Design a protein around this ligand. Structure first.
Ligand SMILES: Nc1ncnc2c1ncn2[C@@H]1O[C@@H]2COP(=O)(O)O[C@H]3[C@@H](O)[C@H](n4cnc5c(N)ncnc54)O[C@@H]3COP(=O)(O)O[C@H]2[C@H]1O
Ligand SMILES: [Mg+2]
Ligand SMILES: [Mn+2]
Ligand SMILES: [Mn+2]
Lengths: 585, 91, 191
């Protein structure tokens, strides 16, 4: 109240209505979660192939607010609609609700444990399969980790309620995914091996990623124990005819079901999904219409109505989908400071091929420095850097390397010839150094040999899997260190979260000891604090509802500490908080 | 066999039965109306639930079905009526 | 002269027989009885599904000899696939807009409909680089009209139940908010 939320600007707390609850016509039916629970993953795969209609994956809970609200969707907003989604939408194959940037961003900003969110969503959604975007050698981070850490993370995630494991690689490398796929197979869950799409397969001018490359990649992914093959289009580059050709050639090649993930950045997502449905795709990733379009996935209602009169239908209940969309439209207005702005179909993404989240992050980073008006030449530098690296796949964390390299190249006024010749003595950001040192992995076709020697001067460059070249982690010693650092016995999930994010978990525990569980507040109260004479009810526990009313805000004293006169549980309590704007003693 | 008690009353007697149950070791469940949201007995129990929504507060405390539903959904075993309200009610 | 058939209802739904394909065929014949140069199909609410678009354009192309001018809105979010389906059926001219002012309520993007037909049997006659360069200017000047923008626009599939045009939808919402009935705008839509 007296200092404002960090990051966003200080504004008055607007009055928000109670969001529109859905009116669902419940139809009880057997879902894929039950088939996984009693029969198994192979029975789930057989059920997917035996379904004529295209299955849908709801990416509302992770990717829709990743690409639009910058992963700022709190668990409190998902808790009011998770039961309604689980009941009124039983035809969904899976719901993507975990992994990706959510794991880091929740700890860093939302001050809530993603394990707590997973536990709550597993409680409120017992009949829906959960999916996390696993990223190969990395899991939620950006640096390499040893194999036992990844296996422990997979074991804990599968124990806590993750059913589908979508594992991709930043450079489409199979050594970085085989261990994760085998661990998911051993844990008894569905392993979704993922092909990261890039370039154009119908353009002869770019022959590095042709149809044959994706065909052999799908072949050698089928050689592993992958349950469902996945095609991830992070930048929305999949043209509809290219989508039809790719899905047809992959169905003629392997026998695994195909899962298509693409974005509506070019505005051609719906027709791409329809063309993949004609070619025989099985599952597609679609979000609700309130959080669809633009940077996010195509709408599930739009893809239902596009295939309503076609030869192949979409397995969804669109009345319940619109009823859920009412609530999502109502709760989108809570995240007004986190909106990117006016959205539009950007066909420029066919040139620079930025992922949408990376596009927004690069735009914010360029606005944070004195280069906010140079975004067009930033895009040109991004395209030229991607070409000069050898046409690598742009997805996290490899897209972050390209973005940081373009930002460094345009910030210090560099040139392709200048970097290629003069920049031997020039410094470089650590992301490009780590990428050329083999931390991310081996790209297809190998590094540019001369430019690598220019970029890294004398540091060690590996050519194998970076997991073998990492220091082993003993869980007992790090468990004891976490226990003495936080003062209580941690679980397996706390240990595996502390291993990947050492400082972030400690900061989260510090804010947990300071402010407590702030995940139980509603979003306007979480962001804008409280108003004068405003009464709120906070349910800290089932049966325990705090009654908080703010009566007065005192003037700041000489020491700078304001006194706030609260009415907690009907009784007056004065809270002393230090104002950060007085700057006086 | 009895591990949780509900008090279908308000004011002094509710806190008295709460203290008796906490001395005996049982858990406590409270009931309150919207006009009684600032009462002491609401915050003196382990869990508290709102009854008689949209009704007169005296009629809210006389809602037999709402108290029964709260006691069933809260896992309560016993119901102490206190004095007054539904203490002498046979129904 | 562009004689225009105003599209409404669904032609692939047997539950609505008042606006079947025969009515539109009779209307096209009656409009070709005059000296109309180009036949136009104004889908003012984004009601034209791509299969319905293909069927309508085919059954109008075998009926009359005038060129077909398709106009639809992207309110349902299925404007691009509708335009491509009409392109496969043999439509002649489609109504598009620049990418800065496309999507949502307005017409589908010209760049998006060019890239949707880049590797098909029928291409789109446009220069996409100049279109994107003009789209840059339109994006720059769209920020001048910030008080006149109608908030966050998303693909609304409720336009299949109530069939308001988008401008009439915004005007009705503004009038409902101006008279104090904005909290039951869903009730107003059902009404
Ligand atoms: N004879 C017909 N009867 C009924 N509807 C017809 C039709 N021709 C087109 N349509 C409808 O119009 C939609 C868009 O047509 P389009 O061929 O341009 O756009 C297609 C096309 O670009 C591509 N595609 C589909 N089958 C293909 C093939 N054998 N080769 C290449 N692309 C194909 O996938 C896109 C979307 O596929 P989708 O069929 O679901 O969506 C089609 C379909 O619903
Ligand atoms: Mg199938
Ligand atoms: Mn995505
Ligand atoms: Mn119009």
């Amino acid at each position: 109240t007296v200092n404002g939320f960090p990051g966003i600007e200080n504004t008055e707390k607007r009055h928000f209505e109670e969001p529109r609850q859905p009116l669902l016509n419940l139809e009880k039916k057997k879902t894929a979660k039950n088939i996984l629970d009693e029969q198994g993953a192979d029975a789930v795969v057989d059920y997917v192939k035996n379904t004529k209609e295209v299955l849908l994956t709801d990416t509302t809970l992770r990717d829709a607010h990743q690409s639009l609200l910058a992963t700022r969707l709190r668990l409190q907003d998902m808790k009011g609609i998770a039961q309604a989604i689980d009941q009124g939408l039983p035809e969904l194959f899976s719901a993507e609700m975990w992994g990706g940037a959510t794991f880091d961003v929740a700890y860093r900003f939302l001050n809530e444990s993603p394990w707590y969110r997973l536990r709550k969503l597993r409680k409120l959604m017992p009949n829906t399969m959960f999916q996390m975007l696993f990223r190969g050698s990395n899991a939620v981070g950006y640096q390499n980790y040893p194999d036992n850490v990844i296996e422990e993370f997979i074991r804990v995630a599968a124990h806590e309620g993750i059913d589908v494991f979508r594992i991709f690689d930043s450079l489409n490398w199979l050594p970085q995914m085989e261990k994760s796929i085998q661990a998911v197979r051993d844990n008894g869950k569905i392993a979704e091996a993922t092909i990261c799409y890039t370039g154009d397969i119908l353009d002869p001018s770019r022959p590095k990623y042709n149809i044959q490359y994706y065909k052999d990649l799908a072949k050698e992914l089928e050689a592993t124990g992958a349950h469902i093959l996945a095609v991830k289009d992070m930048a929305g580059l999949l043209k509809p005819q290219a989508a039809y050709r790719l899905i047809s050639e992959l169905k003629d090649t392997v026998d695994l079901p195909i899962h298509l993930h693409t974005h509506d950045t070019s505005g051609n997502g719906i027709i791409t999904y329809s063309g993949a449905t004609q070619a025989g795709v099985d599952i597609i990733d679609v979000a609700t219409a309130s959080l669809a379009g633009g940077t996010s996935q195509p709408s599930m209602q739009s893809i239902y109505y596009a295939l309503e009169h076609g030869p192949r239908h979409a397995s969804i209940n669109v009345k319940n989908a619109e009823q859920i969309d009412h609530y999502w439209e109502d709760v989108r207005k809570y995240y007004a400071p986190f909106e990117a702005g006016i959205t539009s179909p950007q066909t420029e993404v066919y040139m620079h091929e930025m992922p949408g989240g990376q596009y927004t992050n690069l735009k914010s980073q360029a606005a944070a420095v004195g280069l906010g008006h140079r975004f067009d030449e930033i895009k040109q530098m991004y395209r030229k850097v991607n070409m000069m690296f050898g046409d690598i796949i742009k997805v996290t964390p490899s897209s972050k390397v390209v973005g940081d390299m373009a930002l460094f190249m345009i910030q210090n006024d560099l040139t392709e010839e200048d970097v290629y010749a003069r920049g031997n003595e020039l410094n470089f950001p650590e992301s490009v150094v780590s990428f050329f040192r083999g931390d991310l992995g081996q790209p297809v076709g190998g590094f540019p040999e001369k430019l690598q020697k220019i970029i890294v001067k004398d540091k060690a460059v590996i050519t194998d899997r970076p997991g073998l070249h990492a220091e082993k982690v003993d869980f007992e010693t790090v468990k004891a260190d976490l226990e003495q650092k936080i003062g209580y016995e941690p679980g397996d999930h706390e240990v595996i979260s502390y291993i990947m994010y050492p400082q972030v978990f400690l900061d989260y525990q510090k804010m947990q000891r300071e402010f407590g569980a702030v995940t139980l507040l509603d979003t306007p109260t979480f962001l804008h604090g409280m108003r004068l004479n405003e009464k709120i009810e906070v349910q800290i526990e089932k049966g325990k509802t705090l009654s908080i009313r703010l009566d007065e805000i005192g003037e700041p004293d000489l020491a700078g500490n304001r006194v706030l006169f609260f009415n907690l549980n009907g009784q007056r309590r004065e809270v002393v908080i230090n104002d950060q704007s007085v700057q006086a003693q | 066999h009895m591990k949780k008690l509900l008090v279908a009353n308000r004011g002094e007697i509710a806190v008295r039965v709460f203290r008796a149950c906490n001395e005996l070791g049982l858990s406590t469940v409270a009931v309150y109306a919207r006009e009684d949201e600032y009462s002491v007995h609401r915050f003196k129990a382990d869990e508290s639930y709102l009854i008689g929504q949209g009704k007169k507060p005296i009629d809210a405390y006389l809602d037999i079905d709402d108290i029964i539903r709260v006691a069933l959904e809260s896992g309560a075993d016993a119901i102490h009526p206190g004095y007054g309200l539904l203490s002498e009610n046979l129904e």
